Every structure is written in structure tokens, then in C-alpha cells.
């Protein structure tokens, strides 16, 4: 659902995994 | 013929200048929404606020029973939740 | 380009003197402006009638 | 063709424009 | 020409410039340029037959429209 | 601090209501935003903005534009003050003699002075039943003193 | 038949793709400006022309964001005819001649959009393309225009296909705006670095500070000055034109009205 | 702020290609960056 | 003696007083 998917952000997304 | 002044102030500049001023101030009023909407996404985009309403309602319950010592203690929790944004993230997690 | 400055004069002679001869001048211009580039290189000596 | 579902949607989302969510 | 004269004068060609010439396959056409020349000539003729004291901005119009014709004839 | 807990609670409630309604009526993942909803809210906002700038101007102009109440000389008081010591010649008239010029009468005056542009302009610009007729009385009886 | 062929080749065709919306909008902004300036029945006419410029700009934004060549064709046709018919409703001029001229430029650039096509990448603010100083100043100026920023946001939201609501659309717009302004400043500091520990340049300080002080002076003192200046002007000679001495004597019939006028 | 403008521009790119599922997902990143000040510090570090 | 370098500085810094940086 839109609600749950826009409120799913966590710290793992911002880990520096080869962000080019 | 006679000309009845239906202006009051001055159609040419008095009312005109007032109109401009109003527009500008209404401008700022409307900007007041779409300018700093991003400075609150930390107090308004909380996934699950159930744990915070429990805290708030416990303060209310403890004021009805007049055990005001615990009012001070539960207020301390409320202010620390809102003093550290990272703990808000933890406490407002969707599931756990 | 003299062939063409004459065409300008042809037009303006009509314009200035408002008459029936003037309408004719206007027409002479209109024509030799359309059918004109043809006879600018074909009337050079070949029958400038 | 504004449906009632659309009508509540509209209202709630203007409320979100002012108030939170 | 539509900024110096009005009504039936112009308001036919400017409309056609915006709706036919500029809204076309690459180069306008041949019929556009022909109709432009024709309309300008007709306008000149009828203004000469009298509007009174007619102005001639249609001179510079007709002559520019015949200059372009020469440019596109040479290709 | 009381106001702090009230603000927190208010905001938290509003969020909770929204969360609850999203659980009650979930919105599919990636489902546009419904053309109609957009058109409605957006339209209202635009119209509100129109009424900030244009509507006041409209109202203002509408009210101010209304101007023009016929004012005709009730009487034609021609006092031909003559004698330096004792000014007299006060033979004059009033409304009965004064004739509010009709539409036809106005046309006459305008046409009389039509050659002169500004002369006709004056008459024509003044509304019909505006130009009044100065039929000043000339008869005396009033001897002088 | 021929008309159908023209329209087919204006829609299907095989042409390129350009984005001349920026310039079309700029033409319409100039038009708006000169109509606003041209307030000089006339107020009503200028107010209708205002509503018009505005409505047409909104429709243009719609067709641009929805990438409609057919819609732009229709709009162009209608607008050309309507603006040319408004030349007949002159009854309420250099201002109008200029308005016609700039609208002609808009019609020329609009015609170009239709005969070229709409490019795939249409999103992205014009003044956020480069990260210099001019872009910075222009963007900030756009944000200073009373309602342009908010209108742009709401309008775009309504046309662009999004999953988010207005609140959230406005969030991403605010974030982007702020982030751009920061980026421009960061870029300019990399381009022109300032030595470590180099005062702040006496002149720079004097300028900004001075302006602020003068602005504050004009908040308090200047109004007082203006007010006093206007109000002080008082005094227009008023002399009795005539001396009407009516020595009302007789209780029953008051007389003795021998009196004088201006000559005396 | 380079990493944040990339996020913002990716939302824009994903709306032009009409893959609106990823719009919701990239919006989630934006809001978490702005919900935790410490992650903003990490993401906005000068070098890495 | 306002130089052009100073002039841009002034302008940009007043912009920073209002807008960010
Ligand atoms: C290109 C030409 C630019 C000028 C266009 C026409 C000028 C119209 C008025 C422009 C005046 C410029 C002054 C800007 C002052 C900065 C404040 C601001 O919010 O400026 C805002 C834009 O708001 C406006 O609409 C500008 C007008 C503000 C009103 C100030 C004018 C003073 C006259 C009225 C006096 C009363 C003041 C208000 C009374 C109470 C209001 C609640 C810009 O920040 P921002 O958040 O988007 O930033 C993003 C990240 N911080
Ligand atoms: C559901 C009501 C329409 C949306 C709200 C707009 C403000 C009121 C205008 C019409 C009231 C029914
Ligand atoms: C009649 C036009 C608006 C007058 C007041 C209505 C308020 C609008 C509410 C918006 C959502 C409820
Ligand atoms: C006079 C009653 C109308 C209500 C005033 C405005 C309410 C809606 C405006 C903004 C919505 C929060
Ligand atoms: C937020 C804009 C929605 C429409 C305005 C709500 C009613 C407020 C009264 C202002 C008159 C339009
Ligand atoms: C001040 C923000 C940069 C915008 C550049 C022009 C804005 C107006 C300032 C001077 C106008 C006379
Ligand atoms: C921030 C102060 C700088 C000088 C004022 C800028 C121009 C605004 C107009 C007010 C009149 C001084
Ligand atoms: C570079 C312009 C001087 C600083 C800005 C002050 C506001 C304008 C006053 C003089 C305009 C040249
Ligand atoms: C003429 C005095 C100020 C009038 C408006 C100028 C605005 C000042 C801009 C400040 C930095 C661009
Ligand atoms: C009327 C045009 C002058 C611009 C209005 C003020 C612009 C500068 C004031 C504050 C700088 C952001």
C-alpha cells in the first residue's frame, strides 16, 4: 500500500553500498 | 452631471497601494506553508504514533488520579522523545 | 538590378497619381514582378518587346 | 463525475495540505 | 502590417502565417506564398479603388514576398 | 509545558486518525493519485489565488465605475449688475421657464455646432436632459432704486 | 481532404524535438507585464485581459506537462483567432501594439513546438540546470515573485502523474529548492575560494550593513517625514467677496440693506 | 548536498518514465533522510 | 571604491541573509 511503502524508510538505505 | 465618490480613499493610488500591500502579505501567508514543510517531516511523518499517544494519555490519567509526581516523570519521557529525533524513529517504528 | 528599380517606380507612379492610368501602372508592376525574373534573362536582347 | 469516494478523498487531502496528513 | 493597419487589411494574412505557414511540413508551401502575394495585390488594388488616402505598407510587403520567392527559386 | 503536551497530543491525534483511515481504506501501491482528486484540490487552490488578485480588482472597479447623476440648473438667475453704486437688472427666471432639453432638442444643438468639433463635443458629451434652456425673463415692472 | 492531410502531417509527421516552453512562457510573462502596466471601461478591459493572460498560461502549462501536440494545435488555433478577434473589440495604442507583437512571438514559438514535437525529458526547472551565480539569483527571484512558486507546484502536481498528494509533492519541491540553493553556493565557493581567516572585507560589510540600516531608517523616519510634509501644507487666502450689512431694524419688517460688493 | 540532489532528481526522472512504484520508494528515502538528522550528517559528508 | 568582486560579494551575501548561504 502507498502508505506503508512511503513509510518504510530505514537506515539500511543510506549505507554507502557503492553509491556512484 | 454630478460625480458621486464611490472610492472612499483614492481609486488611483490609495486603494491601489493598499491592494498591493494586501497581496504581498497574503503572499507571505501562503508561502508560510510551502516554504518550510521539510523542517517538520520529523514530527509529522511518524509511521506509528500509538506509543506516543499512550504516553500522552498516561499523563492525563495521572493528573486525574492526582499522582502528580508521576506527571513530572512522564513529562520527562515526552520531552526526551522530542529532544532526540533518533529515539523518535525507534519509538515510532511501524511494527516494533 | 535596374530592371527592378524600374518595377518599383512603375508601382509608385500609379500609387501617387490616383487615377485609372495609375491602376494600370500598378498592374504593370504586379505582372512584371511575377513574370519578370523570366524576362530579365530572356529579354536581355532577345525581344525586349 | 465526482464520486463520494472521490469527495472524501478531496476533502481529506485538502485537510492534509493544511493540517498534518 | 497588422500593427499599422487593421480590420480586413491584414487579419487574414497574419492569421494564415500563424496557422498555415508556421504550422506546416518544413518550408510552408508554394500556395501559401502565392496566396500571400495575391492577397497583398488584391488589397492594394481595392485600397486604390478606395478607406481613403490609402497607405502602402503593402509595397514593402509585396516586394519582400517576391524577394523570398526569388530566394527559394534559386534554392 | 502544559501547552507543550497539548500540542504534542493534538498533532499525535491527527496523525493517528490518518493512520487509522489508511488501515481502514488502503490505497494500492503505485496507483496514480486519481485525476479527479487532483483536479478538485488544485482547482480550488487556483480559484482561491484568483480571488486574491483579480476579484478585489473586479469589485473595486465595479463600485467605483458607477458615476453620473444629472444636475440641471433649477433657475436662471441673471442679475445684470449694472450701476456701480446700486447693481440692479435682476429680471430672471425659474424652473417653469427653464426647459430641460429633450433628446431631439439635444440633437438640434449638437447639429447646429457640428462643424466645430469641440463645440459639438460639449453638447454631445453632456447627456440628453442635461443641457438645460436658460429662458431668462426680461420683462421688468421692478422699477429700480 | 487537404486540410486533413495538413493536420495529419502536423501530428504524426517525422520531425525532431525541442523544448521552447521556457521562451513561450517568457513571452507570456512580458505580455502580462505590459498589460498590468497598461491599466490605462478601460479598467474592466485590462482586468479581463489579466484574467485572460493568466488562464492561457495555465492551459499552456497543462498541455506542456501532458505533452499534447494535438492539444497545443487546438489551443493555438483557438487563441490565434480569439486574439485577432479581440483586435475588433478595441472599444473599452502603443501598449496594445506591443502586446500584439509579443503575443506574435508566443504564437511563433508555440507553432514551433507543435511542428517539432515534445521531447521526452520535460521535467526539471529551467533555472536549476546549471549551478552558477546567475542561476542562483534568477531562482531566488522566481521564489520572490508573490505566487509563482506555489502556482507552479500545484499546477504541475495536477498534470504530472504522481502517486503522492499535494502535501508530499510540496515537500519534495521544497527539499529540491533548498538543496539547489545550497549547491549553487557550494559550487561558487569551490570556484572562488576564500582564504582561511581573511576578515570579511571592510567594503562588503559596509555595503550590506549600510543598506540594512537605511532600510530600517525608512521604516520609522521616512513615513514620519512624508506624513509631516504633506500635512504641513495648509493656508489658502479667503477674503469676503462682499460686505452685506443688513441692519435689520424694524422688528416687523427688517430693512436697512444698504451694502457693498467686491469693487468697494 | 550532491547526494540529496541525486535523490531528488531521481524522483523526477522516475515520474517522467512513469514508473511510479519507484517514486514511492525514493520518496521514502527522502523522508527518512529528513527524519533522522544523524543520517543527514552521514549522507552530506564533504568527501565520503 | 566598490570593485566588481566586492559588488558580487555584497549581492550574494545579502541573498544569504535572506535565502540560504
Ligand atoms: C524578480 C523580482 C523580484 C521581486 C518581485 C516582486 C516583489 C514582490 C515582493 C518581494 C519582496 C521581497 C522581500 C522578501 C522577504 C523575504 C521573506 C520571504 O518569505 O521571502 C520568501 C518568498 O515570499 C514572498 O512571497 C516574498 C514577499 C514576502 C513579503 C515581504 C514584503 C514586505 C512587504 C510587506 C510587509 C509585511 C511583511 C509580512 C507581514 C506578515 C507576514 C506573515 C522567500 O523565502 P523562501 O521561504 O521561499 O526560501 C526558501 C528556503 N528558505
Ligand atoms: C465537498 C465540498 C466541495 C469541496 C470543498 C470546497 C469548499 C466548499 C464549496 C462548495 C460547498 C459544497
Ligand atoms: C464557497 C467557496 C469556499 C468558501 C468556504 C469553504 C471552505 C473550504 C474548505 C476546504 C476543504 C473543506
Ligand atoms: C466562514 C466559514 C468558512 C470557513 C473558513 C475557511 C475554512 C477552510 C479554509 C482552509 C481549510 C483549512
Ligand atoms: C486552500 C484553498 C482551497 C479553497 C479556499 C478555501 C476557502 C477559503 C475562503 C477563501 C475564498 C476562496
Ligand atoms: C534578491 C534575490 C535575487 C534576485 C535578483 C533580482 C531581484 C530584485 C532585486 C533588485 C530589483 C530592483
Ligand atoms: C535587507 C535590507 C536591504 C535593503 C532593502 C532592500 C530593498 C527593499 C525595499 C525597502 C526600501 C528600503
Ligand atoms: C549592486 C547593486 C547595489 C546593491 C543593491 C542595493 C539595492 C539597489 C540600489 C541601487 C541599484 C543599482
Ligand atoms: C533603491 C533602494 C532599494 C530598492 C529595491 C532594491 C532591492 C535591493 C536588493 C538587495 C540585494 C539584491
Ligand atoms: C519592486 C522591485 C524591487 C524588489 C523588491 C525587493 C527585493 C529585494 C528585497 C529583499 C531581498 C531578497
Amino acid at each position: 500500500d502507498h502508505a506503508t511503502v512511503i513509510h518504510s524508510g530505514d537506515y539500511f538505505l543510506f549505507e554507502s553500498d557503492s553509491e556512484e | 452631471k454630478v460625480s458621486p465618490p464611490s472610492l472612499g480613499f483614492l481609486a488611483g493610488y490609495g486603494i491601489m497601494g493598499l491592494y498591493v500591500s494586501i497581496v504581498l502579505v497574503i503572499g507571505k501567508f501562503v508561502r508560510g506553508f510551502f516554504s518550510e514543510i521539510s523542517h517538520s517531516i520529523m514530527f509529522e511523518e511518524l509511521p506509528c504514533v500509538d506509543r506516543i499517544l499512550k504516553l500522552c494519555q498516561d499523563i492525563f490519567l495521572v493528573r486525574e488520579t492526582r499522582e502528580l509526581e508521576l506527571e513530572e516523570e512522564l513529562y520527562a519521557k515526552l520531552i526526551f522523545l522530542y529532544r532526540s529525533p533518533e529515539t523518535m524513529i525507534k519509538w515510532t517504528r511501524e511494527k516494533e | 538590378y535596374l530592371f527592378w528599380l524600374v518595377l518599383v517606380v512603375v508601382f509608385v507612379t500609379g500609387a501617387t497619381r490616383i487615377s485609372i492610368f495609375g491602376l494600370g501602372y500598378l498592374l504593370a508592376c504586379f505582372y512584371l514582378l511575377l513574370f519578370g525574373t523570366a524576362l530579365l534573362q530572356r529579354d536581355t536582347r532577345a525581344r525586349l518587346v | 463525475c465526482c464520486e463520494s469516494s472521490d469527495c472524501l478523498e478531496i476533502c481529506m487531502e485538502c485537510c492534509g495540505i493544511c493540517f498534518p496528513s | 502590417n497588422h500593427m499599422v493597419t487593421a480590420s480586413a487589411g491584414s487579419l487574414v494574412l497574419p492569421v494564415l502565417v500563424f496557422l498555415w505557414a508556421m504550422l506546416s511540413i518544413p518550408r510552408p508551401s508554394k500556395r501559401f506564398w502565392m496566396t500571400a502575394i495575391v492577397f497583398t495585390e488584391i488589397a492594394v488594388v481595392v485600397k486604390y479603388l478606395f478607406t481613403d488616402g490609402y497607405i502602402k505598407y503593402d509595397l514593402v510587403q509585396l516586394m519582400a514576398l517576391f524577394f523570398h520567392r526569388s530566394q527559394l527559386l534559386c534554392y | 509545558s502544559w501547552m507543550c503536551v497539548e500540542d504534542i497530543y493534538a498533532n499525535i491525534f491527527i496523525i493517528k486518525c490518518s493512520r487509522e483511515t489508511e488501515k481502514k481504506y488502503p490505497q494500492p501501491k503505485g496507483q496514480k493519485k486519481k485525476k479527479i482528486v487532483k483536479y478538485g484540490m488544485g482547482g480550488l487552490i487556483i480559484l482561491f489565488l484568483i480571488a486574491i488578485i483579480w476579484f478585489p480588482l473586479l469589485f473595486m472597479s465595479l463600485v467605483r465605475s458607477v458615476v453620473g447623476v444629472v444636475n440641471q440648473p433649477i433657475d436662471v438667475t441673471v442679475t445684470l449688475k449694472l450701476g456701480g453704486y446700486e447693481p440692479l437688472f435682476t429680471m430672471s427666471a425659474q424652473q417653469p421657464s427653464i426647459i430641460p432639453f429633450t433628446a431631439q432638442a439635444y440633437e438640434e444643438l449638437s447639429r447646429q455646432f457640428d462643424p466645430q468639433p469641440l463645440a459639438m463635443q460639449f453638447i454631445s458629451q453632456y447627456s440628453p436632459e442635461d443641457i438645460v434652456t436658460a429662458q431668462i425673463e426680461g420683462s421688468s415692472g421692478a422699477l429700480w432704486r | 481532404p487537404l486540410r486533413r492531410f495538413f493536420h495529419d502531417i502536423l501530428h504524426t509527421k517525422y520531425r525532431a524535438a525541442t523544448d521552447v516552453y521556457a521562451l513561450m512562457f517568457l513571452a507570456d510573462v512580458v505580455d502580462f507585464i505590459i498589460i498590468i502596466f497598461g491599466f490605462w471601461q478601460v479598467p474592466e478591459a485590462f482586468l479581463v485581459m489579466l484574467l485572460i493572460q493568466f488562464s492561457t498560461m495555465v492551459v499552456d502549462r497543462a498541455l506542456y506537462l501532458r505533452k499534447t501536440v494535438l492539444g497545443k494545435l487546438a489551443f493555438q488555433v483557438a487563441l490565434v483567432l480569439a486574439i485577432h478577434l479581440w483586435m475588433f473589440f478595441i472599444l473599452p495604442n502603443v501598449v496594445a501594439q506591443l502586446w500584439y507583437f509579443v503575443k506574435c512571438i508566443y504564437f511563433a514559438l508555440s507553432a514551433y513546438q507543435i511542428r517539432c514535437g515534445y521531447p521526452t525529458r520535460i521535467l526539471g526547472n529551467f533555472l536549476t540546470k546549471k549551478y552558477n551565480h546567475l542561476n542562483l539569483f534568477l531562482f531566488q527571484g522566481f521564489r520572490l515573485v508573490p505566487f509563482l512558486v506555489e502556482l507552479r507546484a500545484v499546477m504541475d502536481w495536477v498534470w504530472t502523474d504522481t502517486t503522492l498528494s499535494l502535501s508530499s509533492w510540496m515537500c519534495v519541491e521544497d527539499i529540491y529548492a533548498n538543496i539547489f540553493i545550497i549547491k549553487c553556493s557550494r559550487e561558487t565557493e569551490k570556484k572562488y575560494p576564500q582564504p582561511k581567516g581573511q576578515k570579511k572585507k571592510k567594503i562588503v560589510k559596509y555595503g550590506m550593513g549600510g543598506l540594512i540600516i537605511l532600510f530600517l531608517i525608512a521604516i520609522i523616519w521616512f513615513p514620519l517625514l512624508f506624513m509631516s510634509l504633506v500635512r504641513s501644507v495648509v493656508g489658502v487666502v479667503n477674503q469676503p467677496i462682499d460686505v452685506t450689512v443688513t441692519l435689520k431694524l424694524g422688528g416687523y419688517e427688517p430693512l436697512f440693506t444698504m451694502s457693498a460688493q467686491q469693487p468697494s
Side-chain angles (χ1 to χ4, degrees), chain A, chain B, chain C, chain D, chain E, chain F residues 1-100 102-105 107-122 124-142 144-145, chain G:
Chain A
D1 304 314
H2 191 245
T4 95
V5 83
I6 66 172
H7 295 323
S8 60
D10 221 27
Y11 289 103
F12 82 105
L13 311 159
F14 305 105
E15 284 157 355
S16 265
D17 16 71
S18 65
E19 5 84 63
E20 339 105 1
Chain B
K1 320 175 114 248
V2 87
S3 149
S6 18
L7 10 129
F9 196 136
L10 227 293
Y13 43 85
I15 318 181
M16 258 336 257
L18 148 228
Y19 158 79
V20 175
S21 110
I22 290 159
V23 168
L24 295 168
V25 311
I26 298 277
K28 229 248 124 337
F29 172 57
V30 188
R31 282 308 233 112
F33 317 127
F34 327 112
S35 50
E36 296 152 309
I37 10 170
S38 74
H39 288 307
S40 10
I41 58 186
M42 39 169 31
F43 299 125
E44 249 105 90
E45 243 70 45
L46 314 168
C48 121
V49 286
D50 300 271
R51 255 197 282 196
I52 333 195
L53 53 100
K54 277 165 219 133
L55 232 183
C56 286
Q57 279 144 15
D58 282 349
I59 305 197
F60 302 145
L61 237 128
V62 91
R63 261 196 250 118
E64 340 200 34
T65 191
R66 256 100 237 214
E67 267 251 53
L68 308 185
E69 20 265 307
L70 284 105
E71 178 197 6
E72 322 156 323
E73 275 124 49
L74 293 158
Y75 177 65
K77 306 205 16 142
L78 250 197
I79 60 118
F80 202 71
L81 227 240
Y82 275 73
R83 254 215 289 150
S84 30
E86 249 65 46
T87 343
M88 209 150 9
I89 300 163
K90 171 224 284 191
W91 243 41
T92 61
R93 286 234 195 257
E94 198 55 68
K95 221 183 353 133
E96 21 249 28
Chain C
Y1 3 93
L2 170 55
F3 191 89
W4 306 109
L5 197 48
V6 191
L7 257 336
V8 157
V9 185
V10 176
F11 222 9
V12 83
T13 51
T16 47
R17 334 267 101 203
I18 323 256
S19 49
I20 214 243
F21 311 117
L23 226 224
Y25 279 125
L26 250 67
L27 256 305
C29 174
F30 294 143
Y31 193 94
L32 275 151
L33 220 50
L34 236 131
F35 322 92
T37 32
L39 68 121
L40 144 87
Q41 22 118 297
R42 93 129 233 105
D43 270 27
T44 267
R45 37 126 278 113
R47 258 97 270 124
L48 25 140
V49 288
Chain D
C1 213
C2 194
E3 233 276 314
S4 46
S5 48
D6 301 330
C7 205
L8 169 82
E9 236 177 314
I10 301 159
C11 208
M12 162 87 152
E13 295 180 29
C14 202
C15 275
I17 279 233
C18 304
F19 295 73
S21 343
Chain E
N1 217 327
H2 213 26
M3 255 155 82
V4 303
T5 200
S7 73
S10 335
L11 239 129
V12 165
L13 272 190
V15 177
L16 280 185
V17 152
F18 297 145
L19 295 188
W20 183 11
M22 278 165 3
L23 286 175
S24 85
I25 0 115
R27 324 134 148 118
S29 45
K30 182 228 108 262
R31 359 128 182 240
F32 176 71
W33 301 112
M34 236 15 243
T35 52
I37 293 166
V38 164
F39 179 70
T40 85
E41 282 162 336
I42 287 180
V44 205
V45 169
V46 306
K47 274 209 285 17
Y48 193 75
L49 296 172
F50 292 155
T51 159
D52 233 83
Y54 89 111
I55 49 123
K56 228 168 160 201
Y57 198 77
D58 359 284
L59 222 163
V60 84
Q61 188 141 308
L62 200 71
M63 296 274 187
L65 257 80
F66 264 101
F67 173 63
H68 187 34
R69 204 219 23 170
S70 304
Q71 295 298 296
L72 66 94
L73 257 30
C74 104
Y75 257 144
Chain F
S1 4
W2 172 270
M3 235 109 164
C4 274
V5 315
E6 234 99 330
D7 172 34
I8 291 161
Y9 187 59
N11 170 58
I12 288 323
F13 168 70
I14 291 155
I15 296 172
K16 188 58 171 332
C17 281
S18 119
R19 285 332 130 120
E20 218 104 29
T21 54
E22 244 304 294
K23 286 153 13 190
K24 278 170 227 135
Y25 336 107
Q27 206 232 65
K29 193 205 13 205
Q31 215 229 19
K32 269 268 175 3
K33 148 59 359 140
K34 220 54 92 175
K35 224 46 128 345
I36 12 240
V37 203
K38 333 179 83 159
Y39 280 160
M41 307 189 26
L44 290 161
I45 296 159
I46 292 157
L47 290 183
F48 149 77
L49 297 161
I50 286 331
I52 291 168
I53 29 212
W54 190 43
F55 240 175
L57 290 176
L58 284 178
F59 295 146
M60 272 148 53
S61 64
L62 279 163
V63 181
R64 272 128 27 150
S65 63
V66 200
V67 130
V69 194
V70 237
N71 248 89
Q72 304 185 279
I74 286 321
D75 42 89
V76 45
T77 333
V78 187
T79 316
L80 295 89
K81 318 218 293 123
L82 229 110
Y85 315 98
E86 249 90 271
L88 253 330
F89 236 163
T90 337
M91 330 300 148
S92 100
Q94 244 265 339
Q95 249 312 303
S97 228
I98 282 238
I99 308 139
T102 13
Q104 12 109 340
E107 294 145 25
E108 267 106 63
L109 329 155
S110 130
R111 289 182 261 114
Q112 278 147 35
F113 287 142
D114 235 284
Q116 321 110 77
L118 343 126
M120 182 238 337
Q121 267 150 44
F122 289 73
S124 68
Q125 258 97 277
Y126 282 152
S127 93
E129 240 72 30
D130 212 5
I131 302 240
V132 107
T133 307
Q135 265 255 247
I136 164 233
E137 233 262 333
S139 92
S140 191
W144 14 315
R145 254 112 246 132
Chain G
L2 232 352
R3 344 117 160 275
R4 295 323 106 87
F5 298 147
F6 293 150
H7 300 328
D8 180 74
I9 219 52
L10 250 286
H11 295 329
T12 63
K13 27 110 146 77
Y14 251 134
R15 263 97 99 173
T18 32
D19 207 297
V20 237
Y21 178 68
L23 298 183
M24 270 143 52
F25 190 59
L26 278 168
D28 281 359
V29 155
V30 175
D31 276 307
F32 226 150
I33 287 318
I34 68 211
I35 286 299
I36 292 245
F37 134 87
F39 15 73
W40 20 65
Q41 5 123 263
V42 229
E44 295 102 279
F46 128 91
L47 282 167
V48 225
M49 207 108 277
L50 246 44
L51 218 258
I52 242 26
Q53 253 128 184
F54 184 61
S55 71
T56 63
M57 279 164 11
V58 189
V59 177
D60 208 12
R61 187 92 224 195
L63 309 160
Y64 170 58
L65 247 345
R66 285 334 277 159
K67 310 224 294 139
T68 358
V69 235
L70 274 98
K72 208 33 234 245
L73 212 249
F75 194 41
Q76 155 105 333
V77 173
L79 249 225
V80 168
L81 300 168
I83 288 315
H84 276 277
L85 252 276
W86 250 98
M87 254 206 167
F88 293 139
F89 322 136
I90 19 309
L91 2 163
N93 188 29
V94 237
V95 196
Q97 272 141 37
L98 255 340
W99 131 265
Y100 178 62
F101 187 59
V102 193
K103 218 36 156 227
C104 287
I105 309 166
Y106 164 73
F107 284 145
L109 298 160
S110 141
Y112 190 63
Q113 268 301 216
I114 311 157
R115 80 126 60 103
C116 229
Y118 279 93
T120 34
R121 224 94 68 126
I122 51 309
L123 259 100
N125 186 254
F126 190 52
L127 337 139
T128 63
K129 250 108 223 59
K130 316 138 252 299
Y131 305 108
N132 279 340
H133 247 144
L134 226 258
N135 281 239
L136 209 237
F137 301 145
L138 317 166
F139 191 63
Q140 300 167 309
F142 147 78
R143 297 206 111 233
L144 282 164
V145 178
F147 296 111
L148 241 184
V149 232
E150 35 255 273
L151 269 163
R152 206 212 190 247
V154 182
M155 246 158 19
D156 292 7
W157 181 68
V158 184
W159 337 119
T160 319
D161 296 337
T162 99
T163 45
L164 322 165
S165 74
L166 232 212
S167 353
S168 4
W169 172 270
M170 235 109 164
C171 274
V172 315
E173 234 99 330
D174 172 34
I175 291 161
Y176 187 59
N178 170 58
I179 288 323
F180 168 70
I181 291 155
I182 296 172
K183 188 58 171 333
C184 281
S185 119
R186 285 332 130 120
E187 218 104 29
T188 54
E189 244 304 294
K190 286 153 13 190
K191 278 170 227 135
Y192 337 107
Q194 206 232 65
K196 193 205 13 205
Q198 215 229 19
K199 269 268 175 3
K200 148 59 359 140
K201 220 54 92 175
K202 224 46 128 344
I203 12 240
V204 203
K205 333 179 83 159
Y206 280 160
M208 307 189 26
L211 290 161
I212 296 159
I213 292 157
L214 290 183
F215 149 77
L216 297 161
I217 286 331
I219 291 168
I220 29 212
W221 190 43
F222 240 175
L224 290 176
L225 284 178
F226 295 146
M227 272 148 53
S228 64
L229 279 163
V230 182
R231 272 128 27 150
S232 63
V233 200
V234 130
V236 194
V237 237
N238 248 89
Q239 304 185 279
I241 286 321
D242 42 89
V243 45
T244 333
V245 187
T246 316
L247 295 89
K248 318 219 293 123
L249 229 110
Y252 315 98
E253 249 90 271
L255 253 330
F256 236 163
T257 337
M258 330 300 148
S259 100
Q261 244 265 339
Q262 249 312 303
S264 228

